[PDB]
C-alpha cells in the first residue's frame, strides 16, 4: 500500500510518459468488458444489410416470418433510432 505509493510517486517524477502509457493501455484493456454499449455495437454491426436478404419459400408453417416488409413480424430497428 505504501510501497506502491512511493513507487508510483517516483515513476510520476521520473517517467511520466510511461505512467500515462500504462494507464491508457490498462483502461483500454479493462473498460470494454464493463460497458453496456459493447452489445449495442455488436447489434449495430449485425443490423447492417450488406447483401440481399433471400426470401424463404412459404410452406404455411412460418408464423414469425413476414410476407411483406411492412408487416409486423421480423426484426425491428426501433431501438436504433432512439439510440
Amino acid at each position: 500500500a505504501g510501497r506502491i505509493a512511493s513507487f508510483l510517486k517516483n515513476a510520476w517524477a521520473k517517467e511520466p510518459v510511461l505512467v500515462a502509457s500504462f494507464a491508457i493501455g490498462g483502461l483500454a484493456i479493462i473498460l470494454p468488458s464493463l460497458s453496456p454499449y459493447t452489445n449495442y455495437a455488436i447489434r449495430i454491426n449485425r443490423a447492417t444489410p450488406y447483401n440481399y436478404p433471400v426470401p424463404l419459400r412459404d410452406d404455411g408453417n412460418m408464423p414469425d416470418v413476414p410476407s411483406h416488409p411492412q408487416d409486423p413480424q421480423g426484426p425491428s430497428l426501433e431501438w436504433l433510432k432512439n439510440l
Binding site: 449495430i44 447492417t48 436478404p53 430497428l77
Partner: peptide, 16 residues
C-alpha cells in the same frame, strides 16, 4: 457516428 450508421443502413436498403 451513430447517425452515420443509420444513414448507411438507409441507403443499403435502397440498394436492396
Amino acid at each position: 457516428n451513430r447517425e452515420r450508421r443509420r444513414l448507411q443502413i438507409e441507403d443499403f436498403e435502397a440498394r436492396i
